[PDB]
Amino acid sequence: KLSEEQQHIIAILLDAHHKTYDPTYADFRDFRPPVRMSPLSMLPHLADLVSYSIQKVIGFAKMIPGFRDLTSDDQIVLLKSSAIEVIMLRSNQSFTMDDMSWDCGSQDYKYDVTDVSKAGHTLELIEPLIKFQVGLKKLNLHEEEHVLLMAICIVSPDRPGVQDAKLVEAIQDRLSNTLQTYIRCRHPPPGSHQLYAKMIQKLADLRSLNEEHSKQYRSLSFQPENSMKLTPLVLEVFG
């Protein structure tokens, strides 16, 4: 049932993810240091973390089968709109339900509600984000499923500004069908029960998170002294 084209897709995506996701988190040392101790104390560190994570999401995206047949303008629009969402999705790998934190290997790099709050965010974003993390983590995805969902998130044809939507859809459709078929052949029940649908629902939850994030961004953004603490990439991508 899983064709050779579909096995190839999955193998490309697993490797691309491995090339762009370091589970030792060694590069975190290059970020401006976190400060816990002060309302925006964590902002430099998390801005840096986000900025790096944008870079890695781009590196992953470039490797998506089909992505390179898209025009530059379309590449750009897909990345601008999906970046935060893929960062949210990829963060699930460090997210632990033990204490509802993202644990990047050491206490310095273990982030919780109060760390995020000290980056200029409120429960308007954080509560539904931790709920996302929890509900995503409970799906217990195979890594194969994880990378397919991130790819499907990026190659989304309804993002506004998209020119060649039909091309975006054919690409996305190839990855949806690979994901559908993978779950059927490799995901045993009961974990497979309604699993595609539950994954598609998470992409819907990410639309709402993206919305709220863009709103908090605009607010922070309006204060030139905080906007100063960001990075040039983050300013370019998040506007």
Partner: peptide
């Protein structure tokens, strides 16, 4: 477009 860094990282 005015997205030079993102253009550059995509090429």
């Amino acid at each position: 477009k005015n997205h030079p860094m993102l253009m550059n990282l995509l090429k």
